[PDB]
DNA sequence: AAAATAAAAGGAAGTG
DNA sequence: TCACTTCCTTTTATTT
């Protein structure tokens, strides 16, 4: 099955939800969410997983802080900002 | 100088 | 044991 960061990385390289998520530094691997239109992206992710309840950002973001330990995606000290690890993008 | 509102944080139990 | 998911609470940041 699909992991969350791959669902995000795909949208970014897709332009699928440019309104809800966009690159901040495609180089450095930084991305950001829209404060207004983020809940719509969270809803889709939950829909692609088949969860028992509809997905919110608060819960999706919870799954993001777990990546902190494994290294895939680290939080950035800026509103609604995260960063992919080099291993996820390339070299 | 406060509120109000949103973001971040993280323990713990639940789910296939 | 993954990979989140759900819930709850508290702290921190921003915006109003």
From Swiss-Prot:
Induction: Highly expressed in both FV-P and FV-A-induced erythro-leukemia cell lines that have undergone rearrangements of the SPI1 gene due to the insertion of SFFV. Negatively regulated by microRNA-155 (miR-155). DNA binds at residues 49, 62, 65, 75. In the bone marrow, concentrated in hematopoietic stem cell, lymphoid progenitor, myeloid lineage (granulocyte macrophage progenitors, classical dendritic cells, monocytes) and B-cell clusters. Among B-cells, predominantly expressed in pre-B1 cells. Expressed in germinal center B-cells. It is found in: Nucleus. Residues 2-85 bind DNA. Belongs to the ETS family. Binds DNA as a monomer. Can form homomers. Directly interacts with CEBPD/NF-IL6-beta; this interaction does not affect DNA-binding properties of each partner. Interacts with NONO/p54(nrb). Interacts with RUNX1/AML1. Interacts with GFI1; the interaction represses SPI1 transcriptional activity, hence blocks SPI1-induced macrophage differentiation of myeloid progenitor cells. Interacts with CEBPE. Interacts with IRF4/Pip and IRF8. Interacts with JUN. Interacts with RB1. Interacts with TBP. Pioneer transcription factor, which controls hematopoietic cell fate by decompacting stem cell heterochromatin and allowing other transcription factors to enter otherwise inaccessible genomic sites. Once in open chromatin, can directly control gene expression by binding genetic regulatory elements and can also more broadly influence transcription by recruiting transcription factors, such as interferon regulatory factors (IRFs), to otherwise inaccessible genomic regions. Transcriptionally activates genes important for myeloid and lymphoid lineages, such as CSF1R. It is linked to Agammaglobulinemia 10, autosomal dominant: A form of agammaglobulinemia, a primary immunodeficiency characterized by profoundly low or absent serum antibodies and low or absent circulating B-cells due to an early block of B-cell development. Affected individuals develop severe infections in the first years of life. This is Transcription factor PU.1. It comes from Homo sapiens. The lineage of its organism: Eukaryota, Metazoa, Chordata, Craniata, Vertebrata. The chain holds residues 169 to 259 of 270 of the full protein.
